[PDB]
Amino acid sequence: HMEELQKSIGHKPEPTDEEWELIKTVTEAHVATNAQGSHWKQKRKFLPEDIGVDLEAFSHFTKIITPAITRVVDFAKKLPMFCELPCEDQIILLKGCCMEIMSLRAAVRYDPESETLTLNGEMAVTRGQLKNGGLGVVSDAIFDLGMSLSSFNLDDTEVALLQAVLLMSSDRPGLACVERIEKYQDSFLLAFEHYINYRKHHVTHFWPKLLMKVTDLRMIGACHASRFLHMKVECPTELFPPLFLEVFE
Ligand SMILES: N[C@@H](Cc1cc(I)c(Oc2ccc(O)c(I)c2)c(I)c1)C(=O)O
Hints:
Blueprint: H1 3-8, H2 17-33, E1 45-46, H3 55-77, H4 80-83, H5 87-107, E2 117-119, E3 123-125, H6 127-135, H7 137-149, H8 156-167, H9 178-199, H10 206-233, H11 242-248
Parallel strand pairs: 1-3
Antiparallel strand pairs: 2-3
Helix pairs in contact: 2-3, 2-8, 2-9, 3-5, 3-6, 3-11, 5-7, 5-8, 5-10, 6-7, 7-10, 8-9
């Protein structure tokens, strides 16, 4: 052990044995629940230029959102720390992280040849389409993120660990087990940092840079809560799948 003194000497600690297990678990959790795995660039339908609040865009995205929400719940269920928490807390962390995690899984499928992200592994959209379909400027935040993340060269473990950091956010309103959720967080952040030392990215100050993405995903979430209200007034209610409603209010 002895984190602060290794650092202080200039050494970059790689993962302890217990951390490599934590990493194997989050990584498999993510890889299991990540639609179409590594086979996504070919298994993807480009949404027609003409689907262009544009109601038919909205309708295509709401048709696929229910599975995408459920693959996040699945991600969480495969983290034993999440199972150690009370039911109210779990629901509370899911509702909090759900847009954050979906946004991240979209951003990391950004493709610069086509300027598209891919939703659910299956539907590639432009900025325009995602924006006009209900996301507004949340779409711009998501593409700008994905563009940026593409020099971070993240792998499945780094995305998985980001998801675990967002999932274990102890500042959500109403939580009962705050300090336990922070302990699990710190345990993820510590594994994640150690994992990045091992990765030896060729980017100056990679860690703090990656932490700044956590904040941007949080902003994308908060900002999506607001878009969702603007949608309750524009689009119906009958246009909204029931899992969508329950997660977002
Ligand atoms: N692509 C992700 C899942 C993912 C699915 C969908 I539909 C997305 O679009 C949204 C989300 C919220 C909204 O209110 C609207 I309107 C559209 C995003 I951004 C992400 C995955 O692989 O899990």
